[PDB]
Amino acid sequence: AYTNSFTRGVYYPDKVFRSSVLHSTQDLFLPFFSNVTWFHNPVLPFNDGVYFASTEKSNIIRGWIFGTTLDSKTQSLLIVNNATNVVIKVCEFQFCNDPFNNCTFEYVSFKNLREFVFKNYFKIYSKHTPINDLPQGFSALEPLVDLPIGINITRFQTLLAAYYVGYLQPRTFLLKYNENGTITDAVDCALDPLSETKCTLKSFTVEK
Amino acid sequence: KKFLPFQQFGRDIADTTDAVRDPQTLEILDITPCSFGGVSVITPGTNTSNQVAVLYQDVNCTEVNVFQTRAGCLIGAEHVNNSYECDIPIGAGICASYQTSQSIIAYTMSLGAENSVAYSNNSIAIPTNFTISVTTEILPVSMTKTSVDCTMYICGDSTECSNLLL
Amino acid sequence: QYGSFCTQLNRALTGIAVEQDKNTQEVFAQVKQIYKTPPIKDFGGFNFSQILPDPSKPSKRSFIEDLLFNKVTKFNGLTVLPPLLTDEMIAQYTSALLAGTITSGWTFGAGAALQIPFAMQMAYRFNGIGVTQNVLYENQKLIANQFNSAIGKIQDSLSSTASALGKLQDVVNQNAQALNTLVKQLSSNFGAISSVLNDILSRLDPPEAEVQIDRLITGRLQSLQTYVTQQLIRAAEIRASANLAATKMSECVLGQSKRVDFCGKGYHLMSFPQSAPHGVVFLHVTYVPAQEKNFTTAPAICHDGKAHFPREGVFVSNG
Amino acid sequence: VNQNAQALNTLVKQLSSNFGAISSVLNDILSRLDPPEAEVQIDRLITGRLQSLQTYVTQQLIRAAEIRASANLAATKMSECVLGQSKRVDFCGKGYHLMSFPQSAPHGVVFLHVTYVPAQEKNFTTAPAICHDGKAHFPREGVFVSNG
Amino acid sequence: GIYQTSNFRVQPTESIVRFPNITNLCPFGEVFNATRFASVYAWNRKRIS
Numbered sequence A: 001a002y003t004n005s006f007t008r009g010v011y012y013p014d015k016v017f018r019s020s021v022l023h024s025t026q027d028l029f030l031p032f033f034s035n036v037t038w039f040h041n042p043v044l045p046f047n048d049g050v051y052f053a054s055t056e057k058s059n060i061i062r063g064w065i066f067g068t069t070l071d072s073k074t075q076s077l078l079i080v081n082n083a084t085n086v087v088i089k090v091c092e093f094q095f096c097n098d099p100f101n102n103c104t105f106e107y108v109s110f111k112n113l114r115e116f117v118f119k120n121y122f123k124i125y126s127k128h129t130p131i132n133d134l135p136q137g138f139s140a141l142e143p144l145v146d147l148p149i150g151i152n153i154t155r156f157q158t159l160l161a162a163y164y165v166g167y168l169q170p171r172t173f174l175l176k177y178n179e180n181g182t183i184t185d186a187v188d189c190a191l192d193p194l195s196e197t198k199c200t201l202k203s204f205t206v207e208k
Numbered sequence B: 001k002k003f004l005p006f007q008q009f010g011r012d013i014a015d016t017t018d019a020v021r022d023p024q025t026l027e028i029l030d031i032t033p034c035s036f037g038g039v040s041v042i043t044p045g046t047n048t049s050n051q052v053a054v055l056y057q058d059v060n061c062t063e064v065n066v067f068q069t070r071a072g073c074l075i076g077a078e079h080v081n082n083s084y085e086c087d088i089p090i091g092a093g094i095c096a097s098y099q100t101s102q103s104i105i106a107y108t109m110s111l112g113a114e115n116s117v118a119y120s121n122n123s124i125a126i127p128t129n130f131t132i133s134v135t136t137e138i139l140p141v142s143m144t145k146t147s148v149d150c151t152m153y154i155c156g157d158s159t160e161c162s163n164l165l166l
Numbered sequence C: 001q002y003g004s005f006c007t008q009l010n011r012a013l014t015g016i017a018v019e020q021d022k023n024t025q026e027v028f029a030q031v032k033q034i035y036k037t038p039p040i041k042d043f044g045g046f047n048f049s050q051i052l053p054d055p056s057k058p059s060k061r062s063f064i065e066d067l068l069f070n071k072v073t074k075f076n077g078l079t080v081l082p083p084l085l086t087d088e089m090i091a092q093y094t095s096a097l098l099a100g101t102i103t104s105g106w107t108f109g110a111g112a113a114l115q116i117p118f119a120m121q122m123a124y125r126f127n128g129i130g131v132t133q134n135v136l137y138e139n140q141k142l143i144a145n146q147f148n149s150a151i152g153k154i155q156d157s158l159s160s161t162a163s164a165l166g167k168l169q170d171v172v173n174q175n176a177q178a179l180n181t182l183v184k185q186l187s188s189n190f191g192a193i194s195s196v197l198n199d200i201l202s203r204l205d206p207p208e209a210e211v212q213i214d215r216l217i218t219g220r221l222q223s224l225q226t227y228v229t230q231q232l233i234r235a236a237e238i239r240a241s242a243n244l245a246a247t248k249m250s251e252c253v254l255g256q257s258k259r260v261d262f263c264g265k266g267y268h269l270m271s272f273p274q275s276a277p278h279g280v281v282f283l284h285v286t287y288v289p290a291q292e293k294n295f296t297t298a299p300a301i302c303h304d305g306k307a308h309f310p311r312e313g314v315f316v317s318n319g
Numbered sequence D: 001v002n003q004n005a006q007a008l009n010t011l012v013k014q015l016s017s018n019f020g021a022i023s024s025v026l027n028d029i030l031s032r033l034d035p036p037e038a039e040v041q042i043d044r045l046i047t048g049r050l051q052s053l054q055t056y057v058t059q060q061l062i063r064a065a066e067i068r069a070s071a072n073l074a075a076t077k078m079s080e081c082v083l084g085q086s087k088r089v090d091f092c093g094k095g096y097h098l099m100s101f102p103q104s105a106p107h108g109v110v111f112l113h114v115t116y117v118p119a120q121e122k123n124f125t126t127a128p129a130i131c132h133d134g135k136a137h138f139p140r141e142g143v144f145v146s147n148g
Numbered sequence E: 001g002i003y004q005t006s007n008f009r010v011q012p013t014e015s016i017v018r019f020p021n022i023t024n025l026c027p028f029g030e031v032f033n034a035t036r037f038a039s040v041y042a043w044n045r046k047r048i049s
C-alpha cells in the first residue's frame, strides 16, 4: 500500500549552527509529497538512502538489518532494542528469512511517531514526537550516530504496526534556520514552479 | 549562542565561521577576526612640512597624542575644537589641516558661516548696487587618442607566439 | 608574479570612493552659508513645520527626512570606508537650502540672500508661470490649505510603503549583492582541490601546491577584476544621477524651472530638498489647472476697422 | 592626463610581469626552449597579457564614457550659455547669467562666465498691494516699498 | 593629501589546538600485562579498531 510523505523527511544535513538564514543545500533528501510505501513485515531495497517512519502505541518495532546478501556470506549491520538496553553489531550473520562471525564492530548501552534517515560508511539521523495515515507536518531529524563500519548496503529488513518507507534522492532543499538554532521550514526546489521561484530568489515570500 | 547539542561550528550569512563549540567543555566561543585596516598618511605638501599624521582605519587605538574617530584611530594630529573648512578630508565628518608652533590638526569641519535671516511678514531687502563678476569654469572634452596594437603588445617580434595568439 | 593588478584594483576603487563624496558635496553643498529661519513662522499661512528641522533629536532631521531614513535598509580584506559628510552634516545642508528658500527664494542662489515675505515670494512664483500676482492674494488661504493638504498626503504616502524609495533601496541592494557575491567566490574551487588555502598548503608538497594555488589565484584575481568592473560601471550610473540631482538642486530649488516636465507634473513654483540614506528627495510644488470652462474665442477684434490684439492673454466670448 | 598616463604606464609595466612564465621577455622563452616546452610557457604570458589588455581597454571604455558625458555638457553650455543667455540657475556661473566667452585649453574647454551679482542692499518695509479708492492695486512689474 | 600606503594587521599571538578529552583507549594491558600467552604453534590474534 502507499501514503503521501507531505513536508516530512527534512534532516540537519551538517553539524553546523546557523540562525535566521535560508540555507540552500543539495544532497540526499526525501522528495516532498512523494508516495512512501505503507505497511501494517517484508524485506526491502535500500537504494541510496531510506526515510523510515513508524506510528506506534506499543513498542512493536525494535530495529533493523542491512546489507547486500542478508543471509551470511559477507558482513551485515544489525540494530536491536531489547528491555533495558540497545545493541549495534556488524558480523557476517545468519538470520531467519522471517526474524522478529567477523564482528568488526559491536556496541551495547497511534500515539508515538518515530522518524529515521539512514544513508551511506553509515549515518543515522532521527526525530520522535507524540501524535493522534502518516501526519501532515514538518520535522527536523537530528544526527544521532555515525558508524565507520564500511558496510555495503542495497537491502534491509524491519525487526518487530504501521510503518512507511521512501528513498532519498539528490535534490536541492532551501532550509529555514530559525532563532536560537533550529530548522523550521523547507522548500524542495524541483517540487513546482513556485518552489523553483523561491529557490531562484532564495526567499520564502515571493513578490509580485 | 545556543548551538544544538550536535552542532559543532557556527556559520554566518556570507559563509563566515562566526563561532565554535569547544570539544572538551561545552561552551560556544565567538570568533572575531584579527583586526586589520588601511594606514593613511595624512600630510601637507613636502613643500611645507615633514610632519605626517597617520590614520589606522577602523581600529580601537589600543591595538596600534592620539584621537579615536568614527573612521579609525588618528595619530600625530591634534584634536582641535575649532571647526574650519576641510583641507585634507578624513571621513565621518572629520577633516585635518596644517596650522599654527605648527602641527597637523584634526576637527569636525564647519559647513561655513551660519546666518539667521531677518525674515518678517513685512520686510524686503533690495540691492541698491551690483557687482558684475567673471567666473572661470573648466570642462574636459577629449582623451589622448591612444591605440594599442594587441599583436605587437602581446607577441611583439614573434610569429612563434602569434601562431598561439590566434 | 601577476604584478601591478592588485594596486590597479585599489586605485580603481579609490577613484569610485573619492567620487562618492564629490557627488554628495556637489549635490548638497550648493550654498556658502547655513541659513536659519526665525522662531516666528509667518509664512503667509503655509505650514513648513513638517519639512523644516525638528530640535527634539541629537541630529535635527525633519519629520519627512525621518520617514526616508526609516523606509531604507565581511572581513576578507574588504572594508567599507565612511562618508565625509555624515548624515547630520547632510541635514544641515538640507536645512540651509530649505530655510534659505522660504526666507529668500532664488536670491540666495544668485549671491547674498535678500529676505522677502512668503506671500510676496509666491506672488512672483505665480507671476513666473503667467498667472498674475493677484491670483495668489485673492486665494491665499485656499492656496496654503491646498499646499498643507498636499504635504500631508506626502507623509501618508511615505508612512504607508517603502515602494516609492525603490530608487534608493535598489542601490543599497546592488552594492550588498556585489559584496556578498565577491565573498562567496572565496568558497569556489576554480579547478583546485579545495577552496581553503591551508588545506592546499598542508595536504600537498610545493611543486603541486603551487599549481593548485595558481588555480585559486587566477580564479580569485578575476573574481576581483569582475567586481571592480561592475563597481566602476555602477558608479558611472550613480555619477550621472548625482549630476542630475546637482542640476535639479541648482535649477529646481535655487531658482524656478521653465523646463517642462523637468520639475514634477504641472507648472513649477518651487521645490524643497530632503536628504535620504545615500540619496536625496525633492518635494516639487507645482500649480496645476483644475476646474475649467469652454469659451468662444478670436485671435483679434475690429473697432474702427483697425484690428486690436491682446497685450497679455486672449480674447474670449462667453456667448 | 594623469588617469591616461597611469593607465598607459601600468599597461607597459605589466609587459615585464611573469604571470608564472620562466621569463617576462618572450625572446628569453624562445631562445632557451624548444616549441613543445615553449607553448606551455608562452601561453602563460598570453593569458596574462591578454587579461592586462582586457583590463586596460575596459578602463578606457568606462573612462571615455565619462569624458563623453563631459563633452556633451560642454556642447550644451557652448550652445545655451555662450550662443544664448540661459535662465537656468547656477548652470552658467553663480549670479544671474549675462553671457560667456569660450577659451580653448589642452584636452578641454574653459568658459569665462559673466554674471550680474546683487551686492549693496538695504531693508525696506513693503506691502503686497495698496488701497487708494476702495479698489486694490498691484504693481505691473516689481514691488511696492516704503523708504521709511 | 591622505595617501593610503600599507595595511595594519594584528599578528597571531600564540597557537591553540583543540580535540575531545582522553577516553576509550585500546585494551593494551590485556595483551602486555596479561597472565596468559599463546604457544608459538597457535598465536593469539586480537582486533583493535
Ligand SMILES: *[C@@H]1O[C@H](CO)[C@@H](O[C@@H]2O[C@H](CO)[C@@H](O)[C@H](O)[C@H]2NC(C)=O)[C@H](O)[C@H]1NC(C)=O
Binding pocket: C041, C047, C049, C050, C063
Ligand atoms: C502645522 O501642521 C502640523 C501637522 O502636520 C501641526 O503639528 C501637530 O499639531 C497638533 C495640534 O494641532 C498636535 O496635536 C500634533 O502632535 C502635532 N504633530 C507633530 C508631528 O508635532 C502644527 O501644529 C501646525 N502648525 C501650525 C502653525 O499650524
Ligand SMILES: *[C@@H]1O[C@H](CO)[C@@H](O)[C@H](O)[C@H]1NC(C)=O
Binding pocket: A080, A082, A083, A084, A085, A087
Ligand atoms: C539484549 O539482547 C542481547 C543479545 O543480542 C543479550 O546479550 C542481552 O543480554 C539482552 N539484554 C538484556 C538486558 O538482557
Ligand SMILES: *[C@@H]1O[C@H](CO)[C@@H](O)[C@H](O)[C@H]1NC(C)=O
Binding pocket: A068, A152, A153, A154
Ligand atoms: C556494493 O554492492 C554493489 C552491487 O550492487 C557492487 O557492485 C559494489 O562493488 C559494492 N561495493 C562495495 C564497496 O562493496
Ligand SMILES: *[C@@H]1O[C@H](CO)[C@@H](O)[C@H](O)[C@H]1NC(C)=O
Binding pocket: B047
Ligand atoms: C617647493 O616649493 C617651492 C615654492 O614654494 C618651489 O619653488 C620648489 O621648486 C618646490 N620644490 C619641490 C621639490 O617640489
Ligand SMILES: *[C@@H]1O[C@H](CO)[C@@H](O)[C@H](O)[C@H]1NC(C)=O
Binding pocket: B118, B125, D121, D122, D123
Ligand atoms: C536688515 O535688518 C537687520 C536686523 O534685523 C540688520 O542687522 C541688517 O543690517 C539690515 N540690512 C540692511 C541692508 O540695512
Ligand SMILES: *[C@@H]1O[C@H](CO)[C@@H](O)[C@H](O)[C@H]1NC(C)=O
Binding pocket: E028, E029, E032, E033
Ligand atoms: C601495564 O602495561 C602497560 C603497557 O602499555 C605499561 O605502560 C604499564 O607501565 C604497565 N604497568 C604495570 C604495573 O605493569
